[PDB]
Amino acid sequence: VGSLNCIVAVSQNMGIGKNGDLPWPPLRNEFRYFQRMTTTSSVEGKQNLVIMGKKTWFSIPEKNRPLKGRINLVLSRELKEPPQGAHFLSRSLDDALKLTEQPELANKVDMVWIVGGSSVYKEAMNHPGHLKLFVTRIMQDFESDTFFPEIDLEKYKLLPEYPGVLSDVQEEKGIKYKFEVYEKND
Ligand SMILES: NC(=O)C1=CN([C@@H]2O[C@H](COP(=O)(O)OP(=O)(O)OC[C@H]3O[C@@H](n4cnc5c(N)ncnc54)[C@H](OP(=O)(O)O)[C@@H]3O)[C@@H](O)[C@H]2O)C=CC1
Ligand SMILES: CCc1nc(N)nc(N)c1OCCCOc1ccccc1CCC(=O)O
């Protein structure tokens, strides 16, 4: 099992979702970036594993469920089995993490990506250890009902550059955004 990472797209006012959808109109390339980063594994014969809350799983278009080429794990205390199309189900972030260390997954899991939502991000981000946050900054305010938790810049260092991550401003549907990578080790 490799590194633990969080990936999210957030508006200026820190919004990540609204009514089960993204606060902004769909951005094709932003989604492709998300697919690329979470899918790409730097270790032959292995796969990355994505962890997400129940609401995030159901917010993803069925056409894109499960997230292809990745082991999909959903967090929920209500569900009795992984949702149709999902691979695994865990009742807490720790359990999901332990699970990757089982003989079952242990040898096939490379990177672990937390892809949402709020509660999962928060717990992971405030957990001691090595952790990277891949943050897409949608440079506009958008009415939202779900938000990204605070990034403690004393711990999380914004990297000056990162391989495979464009550093310049992007724009789709008249909306500008940029990619950032943060890293902490505590
Ligand atoms: N812009 C972006 O990057 C992203 C946007 N989103 C968007 O955000 C919204 C969904 O986010 P959100 O509301 O935060 O919902 P979540 O995806 O985090 O799901 C919350 C639910 O998932 C389960 N859950 C979360 N954490 C845990 C845990 N640690 N252990 C066990 N179960 C857990 C619980 O379900 P249960 O009650 O059954 O126990 C809970 O009710 C949607 O609007 C979606 O479109 C989502 C991801 C990324
Ligand atoms: C592509 C959005 C997105 N972008 C980044 N950088 N990180 C995420 N974790 C993320 O969330 C991915 C999981 C939630 O996905 C959705 C939630 C609501 C509506 C649509 C989608 C995905 C499909 C698309 O944007 O076309």
Catalytic annotation, residues? 22, 30
Distances in Å between the alpha carbon of 108 and those of 40, 102, 105, 111? 14, 10, 5, 10
Atom of ligand 2 nearest to the CA of 27: 25
> Ligand 2 centre and the CA of 1: distance in Å?
24
d(CA 33, CA 39) in angstroms, rounded, equals 10
Resolution for the entry shown, Å: 2.0
- Burial pattern 36-54, b for ≥16 Cβ within 10 A else e, equals ebbbebeeeeebbbbbbbb
Please give all residues whose beta carbon lies within 6 A of any atom in ligand 1, as ranges.
Answer: 8-9, 16-18, 20-22, 52-56, 59, 75-79, 91-93, 115-120, 123, 146
d(CA 109, CA 107) in angstroms, rounded, equals 6
d(CA 144, CA 18) in angstroms, rounded, equals 5
Q: Solved how?
A: X-ray
Which domains can be identified in the chain, with CATH numbers? 1-186 (3.40.430.10)
d(CA 87, CA 101) in angstroms, rounded, equals 16
Please give all residues whose beta carbon lies within 6 A of any atom in ligand 2, as ranges.
Answer: 7-9, 21-22, 26, 30-31, 34, 56, 59-61, 64, 115-116, 136
Residue 67 CB neighbour total at 10 angstroms:
22
Atom of ligand 1 nearest to the CA of 18: 43
Q: Would you say 46 and 173 are in contact if contact means Cβ atoms under 8 Å apart? A: no
Q: What residue's CA is closest to ligand 2, atom 22?
A: 60
